[PDB]
Amino acid sequence: MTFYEAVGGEETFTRLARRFYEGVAADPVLRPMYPEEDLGPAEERLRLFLMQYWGGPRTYSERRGHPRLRMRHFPYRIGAEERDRWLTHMRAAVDDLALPAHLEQQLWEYLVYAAYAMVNVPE
Numbered sequence: 001m002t003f004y005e006a007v008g009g010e011e012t013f014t015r016l017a018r019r020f021y022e023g024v025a026a027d028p029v030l031r032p033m034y035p036e037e038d039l040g041p042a043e044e045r046l047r048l049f050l051m052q053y054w055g056g057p058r059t060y061s062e063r064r065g066h067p068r069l070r071m072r073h074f075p076y077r078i079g080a081e082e083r084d085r086w087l088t089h090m091r092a093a094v095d096d097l098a099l100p101a102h103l104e105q106q107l108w109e110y111l112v113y114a115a116y117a118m119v120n121v122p123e
């Protein structure tokens with residue numbers, strides 16, 4: 001019984017990636033930063049990544065290799081502003097998930113830390 005299975009498995013992340021990406025999609029600043037006309041495959045990459053990370057299927061890494069996230073975000077201008085907006089849509093996406101307090105909190109803390117860590121603009 002992993003964290004993965006406990007929070008609701010695959011359909012929880014689908015829900016989370018989906019709700020996060022609607023928030024991202026409708027963001028004046030974040031949206032033009034996702035350089036795809038179609039945001040479907042980006043959603044998908046997130047969904048899979050989160051699954052894998054929390055102890056679900058290793059699909060992400062069998063499709064793309066290692067996550068090396070800080071490396072993969074290297075092309076992008078991720079400063080305090082971009083991070084804070086990313087967070088706003090994650091919070092909203094986590095909230096809608098309506099997970100039990102402790103499971104919510106662990107997932108949130110991770111997401112917070114990871115974004116804080118993703119900031120890569122010497123500033």
Ligand code: HEM
Nearest residue numbers: 033034035036042045046049064078082083086114115118
């Ligand atoms: C901190 C603010 C962040 C910004 C502005 C940001 C921005 C982006 C952008 C523009 C892309 C490419 C999307 C595309 O393909 O069109 C991307 C990819 C991705 N992001 Fe972030 N990101 C942030 C933080 C995070 C965090 C905290 C996580 C994970 C917990 C994450 C997970 C991913 C993953 C898994 C990909 C695709 C990885 C792959 O290429 O296989 N990002 N991000």
